[PDB]
Write an enzyme that holds these catalytic residues in place. Structure first.
Site: not given
Lengths: 264, 264
Positions: A169, A127, A146, A58, A94, A80, A21, A166-167, A207-209
């Site tokens: 790191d 279910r 996430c 958490e 959540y 957070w 982003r 979904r995403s 992903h890897l930054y």
């Protein structure tokens, strides 16, 4: 950890250069699934030192239906903070969806009690699912879920769980997120009198930054050390009853911590 | 198809005997992911003849926000009959969640227009998701969403899609369900001026019913024939505008149909 290290290698070898982003370029692959058998040991990464305490705190916050940072603060848990407003509110994220999903007719659905009802009385269900992707409330949440979606399965007295992320790191986020849910498969199973089976992790934009490249190279050079063993010291009377001190991790000798920065 | 045939083999070799809702024993594995590159050809099973027309018609019904069987009936499509009540209503199942997800404050969220907005204006998003798992409405639906959740991804002008299927019958259900979404990745991509990438299928309780054993043995003996090619004959002005006749499948020579019964 072996499955994790195999993933790290793969996003370096196969990922496409994709931006964040209006930020940091990442290397991204899409669609990855890994299986951890929880009977083989607790999935806490030994290739860099990871600490359990913010993870444990958490999760207990999630289970309380809490959406405000206060509880974490009392315990000097700060993860957070980045997201919370002035009064510590995070929106309907959540804990809120998990314990009080709002219906169009005024009800609040407690999805994890549902899940426990289903696991003791109808263990063979297809279910047994809790979702945090409440489309009607995405606009009011600090960030969109996430880990959005997860499902339990019982076969041969072994409770297993598949998570849809979904995403992720892979360097900073993923070790944390794998141990949080493995803890939850272990609370769930003790409360249902079931043994632990598998934790299946499915991911989307994994992903890897790019400014974590030296750190991942460092880490990909380390041999995975054997996996620790989690021991829950008390069987609480329910799942909303665990307390920080009920948990110990025995036999963990990680390689040192690797720090990794974030653009802003 | 090769990935499908590999799955069939695997549930026969690794599945646990697990029952259905007071019915049929199944062999079940939990957690499977398969990747289909859509540039390699359309994923319609060549190892038994499968017809596209109920697939095409059911999807256009989903996209219309329809929850009543009438449209399918007009076209002699009968697959949902089993589930519909006397007046043809199915409850708030898929089309309904996709096009008019109900909020607690009176709104109806059109998730697939959202998804098209996100794909043209913010193609790099990690939140391009539509969900049919509306917890508040599960009690009013004929059956709970089987394909519950899916996510798009754009990288290098290739639109890919990962589907989360909580329960799948590999023999009867899965061929149908893989071609329905591959069709949808192709409508989406034509409307966004993107090329097709991958269709990633993730499943949860992935199972063979035991009275489909001879049929799966028959089928596992057949060599996969090359994959056909889908051609969309018209570029409609939007995604709610495709019509049955816009689609042709070229080069499909399947092996014969195998029928498989169901207990009741």
């Amino acid at each position: 950890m072996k499955q994790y290290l195999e993933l790290m290698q793969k996003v370096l070898d196969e990922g496409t250069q994709k931006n964040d982003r209006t930020g940091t370029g990442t290397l991204s692959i899409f669609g990855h699934q890994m299986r951890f058998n929880l009977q083989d040991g607790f999935p806490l990464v030994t290739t860099k030192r990871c600490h359990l305490r913010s993870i444990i705190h958490e999760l207990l916050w999630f289970l309380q239906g809490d959406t405000n940072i206060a509880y974490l603060h009392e315990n000097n848990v700060t993860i957070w903070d980045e997201w919370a407003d002035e009064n510590g509110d995070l929106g309907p994220v959540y804990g809120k969806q998990w314990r009080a999903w709002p219906t169009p007719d005024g009800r609040h659905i407690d999805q994890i009690t549902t899940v426990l009802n289903q696991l003791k009385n109808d263990p063979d269900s297809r279910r047994i699912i809790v979702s945090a992707w409440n489309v009607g409330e995405l606009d009011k949440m600090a960030l969109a879920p996430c880990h959005a979606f997860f499902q339990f399965y019982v076969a041969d007295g072994k409770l297993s769980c598949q998570l849809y992320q979904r995403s992720c790191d892979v360097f900073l986020g993923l070790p944390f997120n794998i141990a949080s849910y493995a803890l939850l498969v272990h609370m769930m199973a003790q409360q249902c009198d079931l043994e632990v089976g598998d934790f299946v992790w499915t991911g989307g934009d994994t992903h890897l930054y790019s400014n974590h490249m030296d750190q991942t190279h460092l880490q990909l050079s380390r041999e995975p050390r054997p996996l620790p063993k989690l021991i829950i010291k008390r069987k609480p009377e329910s799942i909303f009853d665990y307390r920080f001190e009920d948990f110990e991790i025995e036999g963990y000798d990680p390689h040192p911590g690797i720090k990794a920065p974030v653009a802003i």
